[PDB]
């Protein structure tokens, strides 16, 4: 559960991300596939090579989904309902994998925005990604 201050921290931080959202999403995916090779089993037909245009395209989708979630932080289940059905119903993603991607997103943000990645913002972002993860791993139709 996010505090009011958490929501403000997340909106401010993700705002600073801005037009780099796509690049960062791709980098987080690459970090995940390399650091946690078991996660690749969910993308068996993907070109997962470094610089993959397919991974770059998917990173932009992941980032745009997060931007949507930030915009609907008070109403995430309704906003993310289609994505939840995809990940929890169709793909049946083990919840551990969301912890792994969430971590790689934090690492990516830390590497690119060190001034912004204060301990308070780090805390709020971790909670936000945990909340997103809970929605995407839940079947609630």
């Amino acid at each position: 559960v996010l505090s009011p201050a958490d929501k403000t921290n997340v909106k401010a931080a993700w705002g600073k991300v801005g037009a780099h959202a796509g690049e960062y999403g791709a980098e987080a995916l690459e970090r995940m596939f390399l650091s946690f090779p078991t996660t690749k089993t969910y993308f068996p037909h993907f070109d997962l090579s470094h610089g993959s245009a397919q991974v770059k395209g998917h990173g932009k989708k992941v980032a745009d989904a997060l931007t949507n979630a930030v915009a609907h932080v008070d109403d995430m289940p309704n906003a993310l309902s289609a994505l939840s059905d995809l990940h929890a119903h169709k793909l049946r993603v083990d919840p551990v994998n969301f912890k792994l991607l969430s971590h790689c997103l934090l690492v990516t943000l830390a590497a690119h925005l060190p001034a912004e990645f204060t301990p308070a913002v780090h805390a709020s972002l971790d909670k936000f990604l945990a909340s997103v993860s809970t929605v995407l791993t839940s079947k609630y139709r």
């Binding site: 970090r31 650091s35 690492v107 308070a120």
Partner: protein
């Protein structure tokens, strides 16, 4: 933990740039801020009431130095972590009863701190090597649970 020669070289190169007086305290402090239940284990450390209080707490900084030292030692003994960390495992598991998921959390907070400090140098292959290391350390600390 087995590292390729390329991974070993990259891990060592990055670690040589680590500020040993500060990074452990930053990692331990962020653990306490990001995962606040972990503060229960450090009740004697004084003021942990705000992120500023945690990060500036002298006892957090001092203790973080010891934690970083354990990671540094581990880097020199990657083939014998269960042996090296046996005394620490008994302390954290048998005496303190720290749930082992928290060992994983601290390792990943450390990775975030390295990313923060070194930016473009902390490439995805460098991260992947460090994830092997912190997973090995968490596993060795948790050995009494296995």
């Amino acid at each position: 933990v087995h590292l390729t020669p390329e991974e070993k070289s990259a891990v060592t190169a990055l670690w040589g740039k680590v500020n040993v007086d500060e990074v452990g305290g930053e990692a331990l402090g962020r653990l306490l801020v990001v995962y606040p239940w972990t503060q229960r284990f450090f009740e004697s450390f004084g003021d942990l009431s705000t992120p500023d209080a945690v990060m500036g707490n002298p006892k957090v900084k001092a203790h973080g130095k010891k934690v970083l030292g354990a990671f540094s030692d581990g880097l020199a003994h990657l083939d014998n972590l269960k042996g090296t960390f046996a005394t620490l495992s008994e302390l954290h598991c048998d005496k303190l009863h720290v749930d082992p998921e928290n060992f994983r959390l601290l390792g990943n907070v450390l990775v975030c701190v390295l990313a923060h400090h070194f930016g473009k140098e902390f490439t995805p292959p460098v991260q992947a090597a460090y994830q092997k290391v912190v997973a090995g350390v968490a596993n060795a600390l948790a050995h009494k649970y296995h």
